[PDB]
């Protein structure tokens, strides 16, 4: 399988009261997006198919500088478990646009 | 006594400066809602009667994805100690609606 | 590792040889679904892995005029023993929706 | 909370109506003694509290020429269901001594 | 000197990046408000004269339930060091109104 | 374990044999209400558990023209020694309201 | 080289999910602004030239009292790495105005 | 494969400067001794064949009460990696004799 | 029941690999010796009858200054669970002799 | 801060006007010596600072044929109220020696 | 120390003597840029320090009709071996922009 | 303990016998104000406690046409040696305002 | 008072179960030896007179390289509280001999 | 994860087509054995997993009069590329023994 | 310079009360032995010349399995600072003999 | 960072122009040697780096009949200002030996 990109991203809406936000190591391929505990990839957390996924921007914060974008299933109400969308946070606008371009190669287009 | 549901919920307005938010293990029966330190139920924190309690939604956040709903006493100004309402936080909208349906079985209807 | 929900559910399809339709205490975690004789958890009847487990609806038949849903394995023919599907029943429709939401959190998606 | 020992033991006094003398997987903690169908722990037959539980010897009868010891409740007449005492058997005498030592660690003292 | 009240309060605007918020043990007299590290009062942090102090409400948050009120010097731009006002946070509205009434006895009236 | 409030209060109903109405230093925690001779806490007169303790009003009599409230046990006849209720007095009405709020935080609700 | 000022400042938009905010020890000269791990200056984090830098205010928070100002390159889209601006946070308005005056000596004027 | 015993043991000579001693969850079968991070057995540390292994006592301590016994390969100089023997520590003499009896069932006899 | 003495003692031979030594709050009466987590006595660890107990000195250490004495049952091999004796550690010789004198009042005489 | 010892002691020199020689519950810490009516610690009679407190013997008089020691202040004439010295009595001589040792740990040295 | 990105890139200027234009697996950290034979990272061809490394564009020549950018050292003539600049190619223009953003995060600025 | 600011300042009132008006390196903490020969801090000329230290203005005299402010002790006549007040000068008025703000943070208030 | 020496030393026999050993900042004068929490000397732990003190070597360890020497009162059984001697530990033999020479200046001679 | 050893070793069996016998920089961890061109680790030639890797001796041939040992895979025919075994040479016999010991720590046992 | 070996070793006699033992990353060359904080070698702790150094065994422990050897200067009393010898600890005897052989290549022979 | 020693020492070679031989307060750390006017450390005369600093003896001349040693820089001609060596004197020979030991700990070796 051809890997498109690997890098760290922060899952912004999965956890919260359980344990802050925490960053995960993501591996995006043309077929799926998988995230692991770290770059050693010896402990996988989940593998999400990119089928029927689209991407969209999300403005939220007004406290600490952050940039969010989310993946959502267009054929379903919940993209993963009981979550409507998978919110991924990056440090800069540059990094978000960088990841968006990568998702484009996997067929994940903006809403 | 018949237990309606057991699960974790985050008390959003009781603590703060004392120690974040923290999650508690809740046990809802047709007569009362009790919360303990954990699912071993060997250390109870409080038992709240469901008499005269109603439920309502609360929109707050704009920083980290969270969903809140609160229990309040209609015959009193403070549902518990000096708190106007007991704010319970869930991770998703699905989970909130799931708990609301459970409260319905205990006679706790929305405002 | 975290317990998603605990509550009573009725197994609508138990063979008369064992007794018939009975109510059991269910414990749902992100990894397993277990059912005990009662809420003291002294006797665990079985434990199913939530992997490859899906959920579908069961039509409200006149005789069994209740609300039912079922769990089945997508890889196996029998989910538990010789049963092609585990039928769980609830008094009201609101309770079924409630449990469905809890199942989503565990990864058990509908068919 | 800590698990003291896990190992197979034979319940020498099961009523034929249920099957007869069988081998079960025992889990001994400082608080409870549980036995499952097998080591996968999918089916827990029962769980006894180690409080007020004592141990005594059972004479090696010609028919049941094996090594046996028993657990009984000092407060109750029946330890488990309608059994006045739970008889546990082992192939050798060394295995009985071994388990006795493990029981001491849990507080279950001999008579 | 006659002590009017002693209790814990959270200083909301003094610290932040240095170390969260933290709670201090306050001692209010008719002449001054002093705060210590804890109720043992063996380590004083500061003593503020109540002369020329007034009190006012402050609405801020929209994330975590909190209630704030501040003390400010009417004859100065900074009530303490280079801080315009001393923001004190309480857990409930009841507690804020409770403290306000205490400040009233010290001659600190609302703006 | 946390101290809710410390402040002077007047016990309006002490028997002349002991002296008469006197002012004592009160310490209110979530578990107990204690009163000392003075704020140095060298002599603790008594300590009451806040469990089953409630509060009610005492009418402003011409002779004792002050503001008073009382604490009583819902299970016992005498809260402290041979007293059916502990009467606490304050100079102003604002001080009574202030203490009532503090009592709510401890669970002592009005009648 | 002549040092204009040395002091602690909080970098508000560089880190976040990586590790809160954290404070850095800054050293401003007429040619550049450098920040280190601490005042021992034995571990430098970065040195930023003041050429083409301007300064501007930033209103954000509404949760915890904070005052922000940022440095930005007028000839570039990113002042440092992929960051549009370098957001520096101070505890008070006094401290921000104090630092602004210092930046003025280095030729960094407000936008 | 038939499991003889499962329980916690402390590896006394493998680690030291790396990280104290730490306890491991052991699983002894008639063919091998395996140890994992914990009783969930989801993370195995090593599996040691019982072939050519013998057992012997080791007196050491004189500071904190401890009881040691070791496994060693009679056909090799190092039983595991570059360790001459695998030192296992128990809390009491009873527990050591208990484990020795278990090893006896696996063919591991004392030296 | 008449309490002879209350104070902290270190249990020297119960724990070790589990968690150092740790100190416990002891309560000695004429009938038994009980130890709790702390002086609040809200969490009891064990209650040991003083019947058939004797006391004896134990020289061990040669690393860090410590003084030990142990309680042992003369009619049993294990005074508590599978422990031959209960080793209690004090900081000085004075404190050991102080405790010995207290045990004397409970009928626990030296070997 | 740590509690050195708790135990009953007899105050041999109380004025008849208050009652006479009585037994009280003593609490000795490194900073204070307090005595309560009984072991429930609801009524604290007094609290003395251990600073400048010394201990001396009191001769066994025929009438008061018991074992006594006393505490006195080296700076003050009266240690407690109008008493030049606090006389503590015990049934046996071994109990006096025991308490003396405990007092040493608190810094109270003999004369 | 943190890995910024991992992905395949084509080195457009490899000498035929070695093979020609090839695709390699790049690992970009804040300190180094490394390239391996493939994503298993068993063979690391080279590692360049990101210090004094800059990036510029390479014109889309008819023959090499692809999108290319290059890295060069501002202090050295040859960045790697005898190459004046490292030419990296991508299928689309969006991929070049994506990598440029990642390079900014590492400090590698455009010319 | 925290360093508030470091920067060069001119002591405008040094006796010619020592040299005359000179520029020194100042270090301001919440507890002390120190001045060194230069920024290497090898020679500390003096250290003043910020307690009872206040600040006032010094009129811009034609000869000393610069911007000056002074520090003085409210309890002592001489702040440093035989000087009634320490006069600190700056090139511009903006620099004086800047330092005044820093002094506020240390508690040194204007007269 | 003339200070002879200041430096860190480890108190080897005071603490143990309470909290390891810990190092203290010592200040030796011709009249006494005082130790504080740290070199800021803002928190004194104790002041010991050098009158009647002598010094002696102590061989103990055989585990971790350490060198001990103790101070003891020749006219008393306990040099400090209920401790027979004050054991001070140094890292090397050089440091012990260095401190011994310092004690010599205070009149503390070896036994 | 921990690095066991780093040092130069000579690969005695490299095909002339690549160059011939050469010296490389080896890095041995508990999981892999890697070799680089030199100690700067810029070029990693290969990385072998230590699983199923064993070691054997190679006879000192007159031509290659040096000390050699080899690594081979017990499951595969070729350990690296087309080589049936990796031959590592050292100047002296003591160096071979040294490396063998290091290999034991990694689990690579002799044949 | 030619590096002979790199690896972790525990310095057994340098630290103790300061902070346990801790392991350091050592780099041995024919001219010197250097140790750093970790294998990144970005923070050197010390560089020791091998001139006049010899090596010797040291038997100590009797508590936790450990193997020690030390380097000492034959022309000096202290090999490094005020330490007579540099004690290095290894986990096994194999590792010690492995390191000894390495030291042999640097001219460090046993005593 | 740690302070090795603090104590008074006499600088035996100060030029009369400054005053003559004087006693100063020395602070020795592992990185620097500083001397102040007195033990309050308000005036630091100088600070020398301990790097390349060595120590040698100075002959006891009849006039300066005291015990002296000196510090000098191996790289520089003048250690401090225009002094070829810093001469430190002590009353007794034991004090010189004591300081020499302290200097060893800092790395300052004799010549």
3-state secondary structure N5-72: EEEEEEECCCCCCCCCCEEEEEEEECCEEEEECCCCCCCEEEEEECCCEEEEEECCCCCCCCEEEEEE
Question: Of N99, N111, N109, N110, which Cα lies nearest the Cα of N4?
Answer: N99
Subunit partners of chain L (3 or more CB pairs within 8 A): E, G, P
**Whole-angstrom Cα distance, residue I95 to residue M17?**
14
CB contact under 8 A, J3 and I97: no
Which of chain P's residues have a Cβ under 8 Å away from the Cβ of O78? Answer: 104
How buried is residue P61: exposed, middle or buried, by Cβ count under 10 Å (0-12/13-18/19+)? Answer: exposed
**Whole-angstrom Cα distance, residue P16 to residue B31?**
94
Cβ(H7)–Cβ(H108) under 8 Å? no
**Whole-angstrom Cα distance, residue A41 to residue I52?**
60
As beta bridge partners, residue P87 has P70
Cβ(I71)–Cβ(I85) under 8 Å? yes
- C98's enclosing H/E stretch is helix C93-105
DSSP letter for M75, please.
S
The C-alpha torsion from E34 through E36 and E39 to E41, rounded to 10°, is -90
Two tokens, residue C14: 């138990």
**Whole-angstrom Cα distance, residue L102 to residue L88?**
14
Which three-class secondary structure state does DSSP give residue K30? coil
| Cβ atoms within 10 Å of C109's Cβ, excluding its own | 14
Start-to-end CA distance of chain G, whole Å, equals 27
**Whole-angstrom Cα distance, residue D10 to residue D4?**
18
Cβ(N89)–Cβ(N21) under 8 Å? yes
Interface test with D, best of C37, C44, C80 (most D CBs within 10 A): C44
Which of chain B's residues have a Cβ under 8 Å away from the Cβ of F105? Answer: 81-82
Please enumerate in sequence order all residues whose Cβ is within 8 A of that of P19, keeping only pairs 6 or more positions apart, or say none: none
Please enumerate in sequence order all residues whose Cβ is within 8 A of that of L70, keeping only pairs 6 or more positions apart, or say none: L55, L56, L57, L58, L85, L86, L87, L88
Experimental method: X-ray
Two tokens, residue J46: 């007094």
C-alpha distances (whole Å) from B98 to each of B7, B30, B105, C97, K12 are 11, 16, 12, 7, 57
Question: Of G40, G24, G50, G35, which Cα lies nearest the Cα of G106?
Answer: G50
| Cβ atoms within 10 Å of L110's Cβ, excluding its own | 12
**Whole-angstrom Cα distance, residue P30 to residue F11?**
64
Please enumerate in sequence order all residues whose Cβ is within 8 A of that of H80, keeping only pairs 6 or more positions apart, or say none: H46, H48, H86
DSSP letter for N79, please.
S
Two tokens, residue O48: 């020791």
Cβ(G92)–Cβ(G15) under 8 Å? no
**Whole-angstrom Cα distance, residue O108 to residue O51?**
8
- K12's enclosing H/E stretch is none
CATH number of domain containing H98: 2.30.29.30
CB contact under 8 A, L43 and P41: no
Question: Of D40, D89, C44, which Cα lies nearest the Cα of H3?
Answer: D40
CB contact under 8 A, I81 and D101: no
Cβ(L22)–Cβ(L11) under 8 Å? yes
DSSP letter for M63, please.
S
Start-to-end CA distance of chain K, whole Å, equals 25
DSSP letter for P52, please.
T
**Whole-angstrom Cα distance, residue N84 to residue O103?**
33
Which three-class secondary structure state does DSSP give residue M74? coil
Show me where chain C is broken: residue before each gap, C-N > 2.5 A.
none
Which of chain M's residues have a Cβ under 8 Å away from the Cβ of I21? Answer: 17
How buried is residue D61: exposed, middle or buried, by Cβ count under 10 Å (0-12/13-18/19+)? Answer: exposed
In this complex, the residue of I63, I65, I91 whose CB is nearest that of residue M63 is: I63
Question: Of D80, D86, D81, D78, which Cα lies nearest the Cα of D21?
Answer: D86
Two tokens, residue L67: 């911007």
Which of chain B's residues have a Cβ under 8 Å away from the Cβ of C24? Answer: none
Q: Do chains F and J touch (3 or more CB pairs under 8 A)?
A: yes
**Whole-angstrom Cα distance, residue G33 to residue F89?**
63
Which three-class secondary structure state does DSSP give residue B44? strand
Numbered residues of chain K with Cβ closer than 8 Å to any chain A Cβ = 2-8, 39, 92, 94-95, 97-99, 101-102, 104-105
How buried is residue G27: exposed, middle or buried, by Cβ count under 10 Å (0-12/13-18/19+)? Answer: buried
Subunit partners of chain G (3 or more CB pairs within 8 A): A, E, K, L
B vs E, Cβ pairs < 8 A, gives 39
Q: Within chain H, how many helices (H) and strands (E) appear?
A: 1, 7
Nearest-neighbour CA in chain G from L77: distance (Å):
30
**Whole-angstrom Cα distance, residue A78 to residue A81?**
6
The C-alpha torsion from N85 through N87 and N88 to N89, rounded to 10°, is 160
DSSP letter for P48, please.
E
| Cβ atoms within 10 Å of P111's Cβ, excluding its own | 9
Cβ(B4)–Cβ(B29) under 8 Å? yes
Q: Tokens 């009249």 identify what position?
A: M31
Phi/psi for M109 (5° steps) reads -100, 155
- K97's enclosing H/E stretch is helix K93-105
Cβ(P60)–Cβ(P90) under 8 Å? no
User: N31-65: b or e for each residue (b if 16 or more CB lie within 10 Å)?
Assistant: ebbbbbbebeebbbbbbbebeebbbeebeeeeeee
**Whole-angstrom Cα distance, residue P35 to residue P24?**
6
| Cβ atoms within 10 Å of E8's Cβ, excluding its own | 20
Nearest-neighbour CA in chain G from L8: distance (Å):
7
**Whole-angstrom Cα distance, residue P1 to residue G107?**
37
Cβ(E68)–Cβ(E88) under 8 Å? yes
Resolution expressed in Å:
2.3
As beta bridge partners, residue J11 has J22, J88
Subunit partners of chain E (3 or more CB pairs within 8 A): B, F, G, L
C-alpha gyration radius of chain J: 13
CB contact under 8 A, M3 and P7: yes
| Cβ atoms within 10 Å of P19's Cβ, excluding its own | 8
Strands (E), C15-91: 22-29, 32-36, 44-49, 53-58, 67-73, 86-90
Two tokens, residue I58: 């134990």
Which three-class secondary structure state does DSSP give residue C18? coil
Q: Tokens 């052991």 identify what position?
A: H26
**Whole-angstrom Cα distance, residue N74 to residue I64?**
51
In DSSP notation, O43-86 reads: SEEEEEE-TTEEEEEE---SSS--EEEEEEESS-S-SBTTBS-E
Question: Of O58, O32, O64, which Cα lies nearest the Cα of O45?
Answer: O32
Max CA-CA distance within chain J? 40
C-alpha gyration radius of chain H: 13
Nearest-neighbour CA in chain M from O4: distance (Å):
29
Cβ(G85)–Cβ(G68) under 8 Å? no
Which of chain N's residues have a Cβ under 8 Å away from the Cβ of K25? Answer: none
C-alpha distances (whole Å) from A15 to each of C107, E64, J14 are 16, 17, 65
Phi/psi for P82 (5° steps) reads -110, 15
**Whole-angstrom Cα distance, residue F95 to residue F67?**
9
Number of domains composing chain B? 1
Cβ(I50)–Cβ(I72) under 8 Å? no
Cβ(K52)–Cβ(K111) under 8 Å? no
Interface test with B, best of C1, C5, C10 (most B CBs within 10 A): C5
Cβ(P47)–Cβ(P27) under 8 Å? no
- N103's enclosing H/E stretch is helix N93-105
Please enumerate in sequence order all residues whose Cβ is within 8 A of that of L19, keeping only pairs 6 or more positions apart, or say none: none
Two tokens, residue B97: 């609606």
Question: Of F49, D105, C41, which Cα lies nearest the Cα of B41?
Answer: C41
Please enumerate in sequence order all residues whose Cβ is within 8 A of that of B90, keeping only pairs 6 or more positions apart, or say none: B9, B10, B67, B68, B69, B96, B99
Cβ(K89)–Cβ(K9) under 8 Å? yes
**Whole-angstrom Cα distance, residue M28 to residue O29?**
45
| Cβ atoms within 10 Å of G50's Cβ, excluding its own | 18
Dihedral (CA of H12, H16, H22, H28) sign: negative
In DSSP notation, F42-94 reads: --EEEEEE-TTEEEEEE---STT-SEEEEEEESS-S-SBTTBSSEEEEESSHH
Cβ(D56)–Cβ(D69) under 8 Å? yes
CB contact under 8 A, P46 and L43: yes
Two tokens, residue B72: 């309040």
* Residues making up chain B, counted from first to last: 111
Two tokens, residue M60: 């103990």
Question: Of D108, D45, D110, D106, which Cα lies nearest the Cα of D81?
Answer: D45
| Cβ atoms within 10 Å of D33's Cβ, excluding its own | 23
Interface test with L, best of G37, G90, G101, G108 (most L CBs within 10 A): G101
**Whole-angstrom Cα distance, residue N57 to residue C80?**
56
**Whole-angstrom Cα distance, residue H87 to residue D3?**
21
Nearest-neighbour CA in chain C from B79: distance (Å):
25
Task: For strands P53-58 and P44-49, give the pairing.
Answer: unpaired
**Whole-angstrom Cα distance, residue H109 to residue B62?**
67
**Whole-angstrom Cα distance, residue M15 to residue I95?**
13
The C-alpha torsion from N9 through N12 and N15 to N21, rounded to 10°, is 60
Max CA-CA distance within chain B? 41
Crossing angle (nearest 10°) for helices M93-105 and P93-105? 140
Per residue, what are the HEC states of chain L? CCEEEEEEEEECCCCCCCCCCEEEEEEEECCEEEEECCCCCCCEEEEEECCCEEEEEECCCCCCCCEEEEEEECCCCCCECCECCEEEEECCHHHHHHHHHHHHHCCCCEC
**Whole-angstrom Cα distance, residue J54 to residue J97?**
15
Task: For strands K67-73 and E23-29, give the pairing.
Answer: unpaired
The C-alpha torsion from N102 through N103 and N104 to N108, rounded to 10°, is 170
Subunit partners of chain C (3 or more CB pairs within 8 A): A, B, D
Distance of CA F72 to the CA centre of its chain: 10
Range of the domain at E27: 1-111
In this complex, the residue of O66, O89, O92 whose CB is nearest that of residue H83 is: O92
**Phi-psi category of residue D44: left, alpha or beta, with phi > 0 → left and psi -120 to 50 → alpha:** beta
Please enumerate in sequence order all residues whose Cβ is within 8 A of that of F51, keeping only pairs 6 or more positions apart, or say none: F107
Cβ(C4)–Cβ(C105) under 8 Å? yes
- Determine the Cα angle at H46 with ends H44 and H51, to 5°: 135
In DSSP notation, J33-86 reads: EEEESSTT---EEEEEE-TTEEEEEE---STT-SEEEEEEESS-S-SBTTBSSE
**Whole-angstrom Cα distance, residue K29 to residue I11?**
51
Two tokens, residue H71: 């496994």
Two tokens, residue G76: 């570039």
Which of chain P's residues have a Cβ under 8 Å away from the Cβ of L45? Answer: 43
DSSP letter for I83, please.
B
**Whole-angstrom Cα distance, residue L55 to residue L73?**
9
Question: Of K45, K100, K50, which Cα lies nearest the Cα of K74?
Answer: K50
Question: Of N42, N38, N12, which Cα lies nearest the Cα of N26?
Answer: N38
Which of chain L's residues have a Cβ under 8 Å away from the Cβ of G96? Answer: none
Question: Of K99, K102, K110, which Cα lies nearest the Cα of K74?
Answer: K110
Question: Of D36, D52, D92, which Cα lies nearest the Cα of D69?
Answer: D92
Phi/psi for G52 (5° steps) reads 70, 15
Phi/psi for K25 (5° steps) reads -90, 110
In this complex, the residue of F39, F98, F104 whose CB is nearest that of residue E101 is: F98
- E102's enclosing H/E stretch is helix E93-105
How buried is residue D8: exposed, middle or buried, by Cβ count under 10 Å (0-12/13-18/19+)? Answer: middle
**Whole-angstrom Cα distance, residue L4 to residue L106?**
8
């Amino acid at each position: 399988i051809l890997v498109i990109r690997k890098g760290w991203l922060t899952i912004n809406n999965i956890g919260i009261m359980k344990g802050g936000s925490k960053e995960y190591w993501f591996v995006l391929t043309a077929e799926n997006l998988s995230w692991y505990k770290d770059d050693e990839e010896k402990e996988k957390k989940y593998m999400l198919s990119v089928d029927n996924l689209k991407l969209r921007d999300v403005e939220k914060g007004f406290m600490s500088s952050k940039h969010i974008f989310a993946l959502f299933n267009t054929e379903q109400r919940n993209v993963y478990k009981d979550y409507r969308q998978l919110e991924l946070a990056c440090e800069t606008q540059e990094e978000v646009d960088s990841w968006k371009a990568s998702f484009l190669r996997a067929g994940v287009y903006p809403e």
